[PDB]
Every structure is written in C-alpha cells, then in structure tokens.
Amino acid sequence: SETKCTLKSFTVEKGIYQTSNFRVQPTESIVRFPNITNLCPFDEVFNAT
Amino acid sequence: DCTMYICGDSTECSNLLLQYGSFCTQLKRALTGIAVEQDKNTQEVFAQV
Ligand SMILES: *[C@@H]1O[C@H](CO)[C@@H](O[C@@H]2O[C@H](CO)[C@@H](O)[C@H](O)[C@H]2NC(C)=O)[C@H](O)[C@H]1NC(C)=O
C-alpha cells in the first residue's frame, strides 16, 4: 500500500520500487561539559562575621 | 536522500520541506533513470554471447 501510494496508482507492475527511507533514531541524550568550575563564595558575603 | 541532505535529522524541517511540492520526487525519478541505464550499458557491451 505504501508502494501504491508512492506510484499514485492501484496497479504495480513487476520490479523494485524504491519508496520510503530507513533511519534508526537515537535514545540516549548523553550530554557533557567540563569537570571544572570555581564557585565564588557567596558564603563569605552571606556569612561574614 | 533528499530529506536527509537538506533538513538533516531535524523533524520541524520535514513539515516545511513538504511545502515545496514534489521536488524530492523528481530527484529520485531522475536518478533512478540513470541507475537503470548504467547496468544496461554494460550488458550491451559484454553480454553478446
Ligand atoms: C556559615 O558560617 C558558619 C560559621 O563559619 C558555618 O558553620 C560551620 O559549619 C560547618 C559545617 O556545617 C562546621 O564544620 C563548622 O564547625 C561550623 N562552624 C561554626 C562556628 O559553627 C556555616 O556552615 C556557614 N554556612 C554555610 C552555608 O556554609
């Protein structure tokens, strides 16, 4: 039925008829960045004596 | 692959590409004509026995 909708006909004669495609989607969205990172001690300004 | 060459993975693109009509069908039909003739070229030169 996909072949008949590709040809826009109801009769499909003999032969290979390249139709759709075939990709294999992913699953994991594995992201990444750097181990790094200083912090800026708000702590000091939010805890001064 | 017309969709994978132009858009490339993205799926928001596929709905936009459908708005240009049958340009991707024309590319597949044109290239299939070449693909079938290239095997016939070889049969006509060598398969004479
Ligand atoms: C705000 O400052 C106080 C004092 O410097 C911190 O209290 C210390 O907390 C650590 C771990 O919680 C303890 O090991 C220390 O003995 C504590 N010191 C004192 C004098 O109590 C408090 O943790 C600071 N706030 C934050 C969010 O770090």
Tab-separated table of N, CA and C and ligand atoms in Angstrom:
chain	number	residue	atom	x	y	z
A	1	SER	N	0.820	-1.204	0.000
A	1	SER	CA	0.000	0.000	0.000
A	1	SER	C	0.856	1.257	0.000
A	2	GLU	N	2.029	1.204	0.630
A	2	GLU	CA	2.969	2.314	0.544
A	2	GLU	C	3.506	2.466	-0.874
A	3	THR	N	3.726	1.348	-1.573
A	3	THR	CA	4.152	1.415	-2.971
A	3	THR	C	3.063	1.993	-3.865
A	4	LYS	N	1.812	1.578	-3.648
A	4	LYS	CA	0.698	2.107	-4.429
A	4	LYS	C	0.483	3.588	-4.171
A	5	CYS	N	0.750	4.056	-2.953
A	5	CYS	CA	0.653	5.483	-2.689
A	5	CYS	C	1.852	6.262	-3.205
A	6	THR	N	3.004	5.614	-3.371
A	6	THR	CA	4.143	6.283	-3.991
A	6	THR	C	3.932	6.454	-5.489
A	7	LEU	N	3.464	5.403	-6.163
A	7	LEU	CA	3.255	5.471	-7.604
A	7	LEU	C	2.059	6.322	-7.999
A	8	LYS	N	1.142	6.585	-7.064
A	8	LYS	CA	-0.193	7.135	-7.320
A	8	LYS	C	-0.932	6.303	-8.366
A	9	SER	N	-1.056	5.015	-8.065
A	9	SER	CA	-1.775	4.081	-8.915
A	9	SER	C	-2.295	2.950	-8.050
A	10	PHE	N	-3.128	2.098	-8.641
A	10	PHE	CA	-3.594	0.907	-7.947
A	10	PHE	C	-3.053	-0.382	-8.537
A	11	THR	N	-2.270	-0.310	-9.606
A	11	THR	CA	-1.657	-1.478	-10.219
A	11	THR	C	-0.153	-1.264	-10.231
A	12	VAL	N	0.582	-2.200	-9.647
A	12	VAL	CA	2.032	-2.111	-9.545
A	12	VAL	C	2.628	-3.254	-10.347
A	13	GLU	N	3.286	-2.923	-11.451
A	13	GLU	CA	3.921	-3.952	-12.249
A	13	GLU	C	5.217	-4.409	-11.587
A	14	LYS	N	5.792	-5.422	-12.197
A	14	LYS	CA	6.976	-6.077	-11.719
A	14	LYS	C	8.255	-5.297	-11.546
A	15	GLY	N	8.759	-5.198	-10.326
A	15	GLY	CA	10.079	-4.613	-10.185
A	15	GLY	C	10.267	-3.960	-8.839
A	16	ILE	N	11.530	-3.631	-8.551
A	16	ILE	CA	11.865	-2.909	-7.328
A	16	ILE	C	11.346	-1.488	-7.426
A	17	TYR	N	10.686	-0.980	-6.394
A	17	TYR	CA	10.231	0.402	-6.422
A	17	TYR	C	10.713	1.124	-5.182
A	18	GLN	N	11.883	1.737	-5.233
A	18	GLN	CA	12.392	2.447	-4.065
A	18	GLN	C	11.356	3.394	-3.501
A	19	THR	N	10.948	3.167	-2.263
A	19	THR	CA	9.945	4.012	-1.643
A	19	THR	C	10.472	4.860	-0.478
A	20	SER	N	10.074	4.542	0.745
A	20	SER	CA	10.488	5.316	1.905
A	20	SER	C	11.990	5.341	2.151
A	21	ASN	N	12.346	5.539	3.411
A	21	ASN	CA	13.728	5.575	3.835
A	21	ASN	C	13.789	4.736	5.090
A	22	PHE	N	14.934	4.721	5.752
A	22	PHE	CA	15.045	3.943	6.961
A	22	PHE	C	16.156	4.472	7.840
A	23	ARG	N	15.825	5.296	8.814
A	23	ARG	CA	16.837	5.806	9.711
A	23	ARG	C	16.547	5.191	11.052
A	24	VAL	N	17.556	5.073	11.901
A	24	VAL	CA	17.351	4.473	13.210
A	24	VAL	C	17.570	5.501	14.311
A	25	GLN	N	16.505	6.209	14.665
A	25	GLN	CA	16.561	7.241	15.693
A	25	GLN	C	17.418	6.848	16.888
A	26	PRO	N	17.696	7.822	17.745
A	26	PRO	CA	18.523	7.594	18.924
A	26	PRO	C	17.663	7.263	20.117
A	27	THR	N	18.237	7.347	21.309
A	27	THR	CA	17.515	7.039	22.524
A	27	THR	C	18.067	7.865	23.672
A	28	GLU	N	19.371	7.745	23.901
A	28	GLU	CA	20.037	8.483	24.966
A	28	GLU	C	20.450	9.869	24.483
A	29	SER	N	20.249	10.870	25.333
A	29	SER	CA	20.594	12.244	25.000
A	29	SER	C	21.858	12.656	25.740
A	30	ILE	N	22.773	11.705	25.904
A	30	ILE	CA	24.033	11.927	26.607
A	30	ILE	C	24.640	13.292	26.323
A	31	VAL	N	24.720	14.109	27.365
A	31	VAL	CA	25.257	15.453	27.273
A	31	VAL	C	26.542	15.502	28.077
A	32	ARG	N	27.347	16.535	27.878
A	32	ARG	CA	28.585	16.627	28.628
A	32	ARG	C	29.243	17.996	28.574
A	33	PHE	N	30.068	18.278	29.572
A	33	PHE	CA	30.760	19.547	29.658
A	33	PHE	C	32.062	19.381	30.429
A	34	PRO	N	32.450	20.355	31.243
A	34	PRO	CA	33.723	20.238	31.967
A	34	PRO	C	33.656	19.967	33.472
A	35	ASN	N	34.552	19.098	33.938
A	35	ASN	CA	34.667	18.755	35.347
A	35	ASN	C	34.900	20.039	36.126
A	36	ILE	N	35.535	20.986	35.449
A	36	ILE	CA	35.899	22.281	36.020
A	36	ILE	C	34.793	22.984	36.798
A	37	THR	N	35.037	24.266	37.095
A	37	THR	CA	34.093	25.124	37.819
A	37	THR	C	34.514	25.650	39.209
A	38	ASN	N	34.910	26.925	39.289
A	38	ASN	CA	35.268	27.543	40.565
A	38	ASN	C	33.903	27.778	41.183
A	39	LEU	N	33.777	28.603	42.214
A	39	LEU	CA	32.448	28.776	42.798
A	39	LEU	C	32.014	30.183	43.206
A	40	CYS	N	32.984	31.009	43.599
A	40	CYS	CA	32.709	32.361	44.065
A	40	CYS	C	31.951	32.116	45.355
A	41	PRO	N	32.600	32.285	46.497
A	41	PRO	CA	31.932	32.018	47.777
A	41	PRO	C	30.869	33.019	48.260
A	42	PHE	N	29.642	32.961	47.739
A	42	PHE	CA	28.639	33.848	48.240
A	42	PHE	C	28.847	33.764	49.732
A	43	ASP	N	28.968	32.524	50.210
A	43	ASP	CA	29.171	32.178	51.613
A	43	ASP	C	29.830	33.273	52.415
A	44	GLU	N	30.921	33.811	51.877
A	44	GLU	CA	31.650	34.885	52.538
A	44	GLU	C	30.746	36.098	52.720
A	45	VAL	N	30.118	36.533	51.631
A	45	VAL	CA	29.221	37.676	51.678
A	45	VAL	C	27.864	37.392	52.318
A	46	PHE	N	27.550	36.128	52.568
A	46	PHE	CA	26.271	35.787	53.174
A	46	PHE	C	26.517	35.168	54.524
A	47	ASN	N	27.713	35.353	55.046
A	47	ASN	CA	28.054	34.736	56.300
A	47	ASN	C	29.164	35.478	56.991
A	48	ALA	N	29.448	36.693	56.555
A	48	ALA	CA	30.528	37.397	57.221
A	48	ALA	C	30.214	37.562	58.697
A	49	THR	N	31.261	37.661	59.500
A	49	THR	CA	31.079	37.885	60.923
A	49	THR	C	30.711	39.320	61.246
B	1	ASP	N	19.523	10.990	-0.442
B	1	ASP	CA	18.327	11.127	0.374
B	1	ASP	C	18.009	12.614	0.486
B	2	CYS	N	16.984	13.060	-0.238
B	2	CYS	CA	16.662	14.482	-0.321
B	2	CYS	C	16.391	15.075	1.061
B	3	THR	N	15.594	14.388	1.870
B	3	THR	CA	15.255	14.896	3.190
B	3	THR	C	16.461	14.943	4.114
B	4	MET	N	17.336	13.951	4.054
B	4	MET	CA	18.500	13.947	4.927
B	4	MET	C	19.588	14.889	4.447
B	5	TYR	N	19.658	15.160	3.153
B	5	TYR	CA	20.618	16.132	2.667
B	5	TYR	C	20.203	17.536	3.070
B	6	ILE	N	18.959	17.899	2.808
B	6	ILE	CA	18.540	19.262	3.076
B	6	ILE	C	18.365	19.460	4.573
B	7	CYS	N	17.268	18.946	5.119
B	7	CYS	CA	16.976	19.124	6.536
B	7	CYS	C	18.128	18.562	7.363
B	8	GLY	N	18.222	17.237	7.409
B	8	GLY	CA	19.234	16.574	8.205
B	8	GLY	C	18.790	16.336	9.632
B	9	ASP	N	18.179	15.178	9.868
B	9	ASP	CA	17.784	14.754	11.208
B	9	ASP	C	16.570	15.501	11.753
B	10	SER	N	16.650	16.829	11.784
B	10	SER	CA	15.567	17.660	12.301
B	10	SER	C	14.206	17.226	11.771
B	11	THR	N	13.173	17.385	12.592
B	11	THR	CA	11.828	16.961	12.215
B	11	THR	C	10.878	18.140	12.024
B	12	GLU	N	11.260	19.302	12.538
B	12	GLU	CA	10.455	20.504	12.358
B	12	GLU	C	10.605	20.936	10.910
B	13	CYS	N	11.741	20.576	10.332
B	13	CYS	CA	12.058	20.854	8.937
B	13	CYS	C	11.191	20.056	7.976
B	14	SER	N	10.872	18.811	8.314
B	14	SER	CA	10.150	17.967	7.373
B	14	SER	C	8.816	18.566	6.970
B	15	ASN	N	8.098	19.183	7.907
B	15	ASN	CA	6.836	19.816	7.546
B	15	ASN	C	7.045	21.027	6.646
B	16	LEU	N	8.176	21.713	6.789
B	16	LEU	CA	8.462	22.843	5.916
B	16	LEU	C	8.855	22.385	4.522
B	17	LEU	N	9.599	21.281	4.419
B	17	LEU	CA	10.046	20.792	3.121
B	17	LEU	C	8.890	20.291	2.280
B	18	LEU	N	7.849	19.755	2.905
B	18	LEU	CA	6.655	19.328	2.187
B	18	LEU	C	5.949	20.476	1.473
B	19	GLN	N	6.244	21.721	1.846
B	19	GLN	CA	5.584	22.891	1.288
B	19	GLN	C	6.145	23.311	-0.057
B	20	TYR	N	7.188	22.655	-0.539
B	20	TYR	CA	7.767	22.984	-1.827
B	20	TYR	C	7.326	22.053	-2.935
B	21	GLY	N	6.432	21.124	-2.658
B	21	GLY	CA	5.899	20.295	-3.712
B	21	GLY	C	6.721	19.050	-3.919
B	22	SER	N	6.831	18.619	-5.168
B	22	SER	CA	7.378	17.307	-5.493
B	22	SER	C	8.807	17.375	-5.978
B	23	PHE	N	9.611	18.322	-5.500
B	23	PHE	CA	10.996	18.394	-5.937
B	23	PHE	C	11.789	17.160	-5.549
B	24	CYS	N	11.535	16.587	-4.376
B	24	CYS	CA	12.226	15.385	-3.947
B	24	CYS	C	11.805	14.141	-4.706
B	25	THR	N	10.584	14.095	-5.225
B	25	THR	CA	10.171	13.008	-6.094
B	25	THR	C	10.875	13.076	-7.444
B	26	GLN	N	11.016	14.286	-7.985
B	26	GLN	CA	11.717	14.469	-9.246
B	26	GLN	C	13.165	14.013	-9.157
B	27	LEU	N	13.835	14.289	-8.041
B	27	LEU	CA	15.221	13.871	-7.898
B	27	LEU	C	15.354	12.356	-7.882
B	28	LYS	N	14.461	11.669	-7.184
B	28	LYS	CA	14.511	10.217	-7.152
B	28	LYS	C	14.187	9.607	-8.498
B	29	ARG	N	13.213	10.150	-9.216
B	29	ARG	CA	12.913	9.601	-10.530
B	29	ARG	C	14.065	9.807	-11.504
B	30	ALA	N	14.663	10.997	-11.487
B	30	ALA	CA	15.758	11.291	-12.398
B	30	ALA	C	16.952	10.397	-12.131
B	31	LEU	N	17.326	10.226	-10.868
B	31	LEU	CA	18.474	9.388	-10.566
B	31	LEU	C	18.218	7.911	-10.810
B	32	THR	N	16.990	7.435	-10.639
B	32	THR	CA	16.694	6.047	-10.965
B	32	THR	C	16.852	5.763	-12.448
B	33	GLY	N	16.464	6.705	-13.304
B	33	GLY	CA	16.690	6.525	-14.725
B	33	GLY	C	18.140	6.271	-15.079
B	34	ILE	N	19.054	7.043	-14.493
B	34	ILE	CA	20.484	6.828	-14.642
B	34	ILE	C	20.913	5.473	-14.112
B	35	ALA	N	20.463	5.096	-12.924
B	35	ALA	CA	20.852	3.842	-12.301
B	35	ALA	C	20.459	2.631	-13.116
B	36	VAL	N	19.304	2.664	-13.766
B	36	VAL	CA	18.902	1.521	-14.574
B	36	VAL	C	19.700	1.467	-15.875
B	37	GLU	N	19.984	2.614	-16.483
B	37	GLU	CA	20.699	2.612	-17.755
B	37	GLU	C	22.149	2.144	-17.608
B	38	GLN	N	22.779	2.398	-16.463
B	38	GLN	CA	24.186	2.054	-16.297
B	38	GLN	C	24.423	0.552	-16.278
B	39	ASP	N	23.452	-0.239	-15.859
B	39	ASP	CA	23.584	-1.683	-15.940
B	39	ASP	C	23.287	-2.208	-17.330
B	40	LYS	N	22.368	-1.575	-18.028
B	40	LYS	CA	22.094	-1.917	-19.406
B	40	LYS	C	23.257	-1.582	-20.324
B	41	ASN	N	23.952	-0.476	-20.071
B	41	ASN	CA	25.151	-0.144	-20.832
B	41	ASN	C	26.150	-1.300	-20.839
B	42	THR	N	26.381	-1.903	-19.675
B	42	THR	CA	27.341	-2.994	-19.539
B	42	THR	C	26.868	-4.264	-20.217
B	43	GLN	N	25.584	-4.581	-20.103
B	43	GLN	CA	25.059	-5.771	-20.753
B	43	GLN	C	25.188	-5.669	-22.262
B	44	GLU	N	24.921	-4.499	-22.829
B	44	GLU	CA	25.029	-4.346	-24.267
B	44	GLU	C	26.452	-4.431	-24.771
B	45	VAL	N	27.441	-3.995	-23.999
B	45	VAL	CA	28.813	-4.132	-24.484
B	45	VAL	C	29.310	-5.565	-24.333
B	46	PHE	N	29.065	-6.207	-23.194
B	46	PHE	CA	29.683	-7.508	-22.948
B	46	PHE	C	28.781	-8.705	-23.172
B	47	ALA	N	27.483	-8.617	-22.924
B	47	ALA	CA	26.626	-9.803	-22.949
B	47	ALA	C	26.118	-10.080	-24.360
B	48	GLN	N	27.072	-10.281	-25.265
B	48	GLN	CA	26.816	-10.573	-26.670
B	48	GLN	C	27.108	-12.020	-27.021
B	49	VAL	N	27.025	-12.922	-26.056
B	49	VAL	CA	27.297	-14.323	-26.340
B	49	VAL	C	26.281	-15.165	-25.592
C	1	LIG	C1	28.083	29.989	57.897
C	1	LIG	O1	29.163	30.149	58.829
C	1	LIG	C2	29.196	29.214	59.920
C	1	LIG	C3	30.416	29.562	60.737
C	1	LIG	O2	31.549	29.777	59.908
C	1	LIG	C4	29.221	27.778	59.393
C	1	LIG	O3	29.144	26.879	60.495
C	1	LIG	C5	30.145	25.856	60.328
C	1	LIG	O4	29.569	24.737	59.628
C	1	LIG	C6	30.484	23.662	59.366
C	1	LIG	C7	29.712	22.627	58.580
C	1	LIG	O5	28.313	22.856	58.665
C	1	LIG	C8	31.042	23.121	60.682
C	1	LIG	O6	32.017	22.125	60.403
C	1	LIG	C9	31.670	24.249	61.492
C	1	LIG	O7	32.087	23.765	62.763
C	1	LIG	C10	30.679	25.395	61.681
C	1	LIG	N1	31.300	26.496	62.399
C	1	LIG	C11	30.711	27.122	63.422
C	1	LIG	C12	31.496	28.232	64.050
C	1	LIG	O8	29.594	26.807	63.821
C	1	LIG	C13	28.065	27.558	58.425
C	1	LIG	O9	28.112	26.258	57.847
C	1	LIG	C14	28.121	28.591	57.309
C	1	LIG	N2	27.049	28.376	56.352
C	1	LIG	C15	27.233	27.693	55.218
C	1	LIG	C16	26.034	27.546	54.332
C	1	LIG	O10	28.320	27.207	54.924
